[PDB]
């Protein structure tokens, strides 16, 4: 956890959380 | 959660990467 990795995880779910939400919106709606 | 981050990364790294590759084509025009 120690802001060793805990500081890097925020870089994966940060943008991922956005796409994961719009992903289906892109393929579906167009 | 030190032993959790080690897994918290592979968790997103697997998803964040799975989307970034699909989103790069899905929202090509949008």
Coordinates of C-alpha atoms in Angstrom, one line a residue:
Chain A
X1 CA 0.0 0.0 0.0
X2 CA 2.6 2.3 1.1
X3 CA 2.5 5.1 -1.5
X4 CA 4.9 2.8 -3.2
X5 CA 2.2 1.1 -5.2
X6 CA -0.8 2.9 -3.7
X7 CA 0.4 6.0 -5.7
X8 CA 0.5 4.0 -8.9
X9 CA -2.8 2.3 -8.7
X10 CA -4.6 5.6 -8.8
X11 CA -3.1 5.9 -12.4
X12 CA -4.9 2.7 -13.6
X13 CA -8.4 3.0 -12.2
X14 CA -8.4 6.8 -12.7
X15 CA -8.7 6.7 -16.4
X16 CA -9.9 3.1 -16.6
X17 CA -13.0 3.9 -14.5
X18 CA -14.0 6.5 -17.2
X19 CA -13.6 4.2 -20.2
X20 CA -15.2 1.2 -18.5
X21 CA -18.2 3.5 -18.3
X22 CA -18.2 4.9 -21.8
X23 CA -16.8 1.8 -23.5
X24 CA -20.2 0.2 -24.1
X25 CA -21.5 3.7 -24.9
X26 CA -19.0 4.0 -27.8
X27 CA -19.7 0.7 -29.4
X28 CA -23.4 0.9 -28.7
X29 CA -24.1 4.5 -29.5
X30 CA -22.5 6.0 -32.6
Chain B
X1 CA -3.0 -3.8 2.0
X2 CA 0.6 -4.2 1.0
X3 CA -0.1 -7.7 -0.4
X4 CA -3.2 -6.2 -1.9
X5 CA -1.6 -3.5 -4.0
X6 CA 0.5 -6.2 -5.7
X7 CA -2.8 -7.6 -6.8
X8 CA -4.6 -4.2 -7.1
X9 CA -2.3 -3.3 -10.0
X10 CA -2.6 -6.5 -12.0
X11 CA -6.4 -6.0 -11.5
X12 CA -6.6 -2.7 -13.3
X13 CA -3.5 -3.1 -15.5
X14 CA -5.5 -6.0 -17.0
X15 CA -8.7 -3.9 -17.4
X16 CA -7.3 -0.4 -18.0
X17 CA -5.2 -2.0 -20.8
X18 CA -8.2 -4.1 -22.2
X19 CA -10.2 -0.9 -22.6
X20 CA -7.5 1.6 -23.7
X21 CA -7.0 -0.8 -26.7
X22 CA -10.7 -1.1 -27.4
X23 CA -11.6 2.6 -26.7
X24 CA -8.8 3.7 -29.1
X25 CA -10.9 2.3 -31.9
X26 CA -14.5 2.6 -30.6
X27 CA -14.5 6.4 -30.2
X28 CA -12.5 7.1 -33.3
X29 CA -14.8 9.7 -34.6
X30 CA -16.3 10.8 -31.3

